Homo-oligomer: A and B are copies of this chain.
Amino acid sequence: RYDNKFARISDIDINQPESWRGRIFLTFDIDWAADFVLQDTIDLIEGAGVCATWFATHSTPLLENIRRNPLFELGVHPNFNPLLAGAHAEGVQEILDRTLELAPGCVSVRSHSLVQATSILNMFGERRLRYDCNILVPWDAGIVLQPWRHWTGDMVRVPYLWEDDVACLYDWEFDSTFDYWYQPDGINVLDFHPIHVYMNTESLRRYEDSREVHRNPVDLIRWRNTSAGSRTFLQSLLARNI
């Protein structure tokens, strides 16, 4: 149903454009959020009653909440940054295999910091991942987006067009009265972080200033932006589209 606007990444059927065209795919890069922060984001999406895909960074009992919910897909968020940062004892394989232990049998992946390479995608495919979510093409680039077949692993590359922290870096609006990014004729994948939904981030300086409080369940709420930000953007998007 057209009215079923929200979908999971694994609902994309590359052979059937009806499975993605004009639809919205809410995705969440967990990024090591404390449990109270992740729980708040889960509660917000569960309250809307929509589908969503969650990319896991670490082990937490809240992953079981995500697994249970039939509207939610659990994927992985492997962190290969230490490989790029300087000398290291391991490669991609060890890190990927460890991350996959968080969601055995999953099919969707987005790399922390969008770390990607031909060999990385080859290794994703060997491990039976089917959807790569690592290409970010901005909604304002003038490009109508569509997922496409990768040349190996029967993988599908799924490009995404909006991200909360990226919106801060590009100075995109959090308080527009319409879905400026929306493509009725393309795929619409958005990426949110629980930390920014929790603090209603409108500037990364709020995020940086509050660093010491990000895991403090008593004080963090005091840093929530009361103007427009990531949280109010998500809340409006949900209200307008359910």
Contacts and interface: CB of A to CB of B under 8 A. Distances in A.
Interface in A70-93: 80-81, 83-93
Contacts of A86: 90-91, 93
A115 B117 contact: yes
A114 B113 contact: no
A117 B166 contact: no
Kindly state the interface size class of chain A when it binds its partner.
35 or more
Given A113-B119, A144-B144, A151-B170, A84 B92 contact: yes
Nearest to A135: B135
A145 interface: yes
A152 B169 contact: yes
Contacts of A137: 135, 148, 159
A117 B159 CA distance: 15
Interface string A149-190: 001100000010000001001100000000000000000000
Nearest to A118: B113
A146 B143 contact: yes
How many identical subunits does the complex contain? 2
A22 interface: no
Contact of A90 (B87, B113, B118): B87
A29 B143 CA distance: 26
B119 A116 contact: no
Contacts of A148: 137-138, 140-143
Contact of A119 (B81, B88, B119, B120): B81
19 contacts: A81-B117, A83-B91, A84-B119, A85-B91, A85-B92, A86-B90, A86-B93, A87-B89, A87-B90, A88-B88, A114-B117, A114-B118, A135-B135, A135-B137, A140-B148, A141-B146, A143-B145, A143-B148, A151-B166
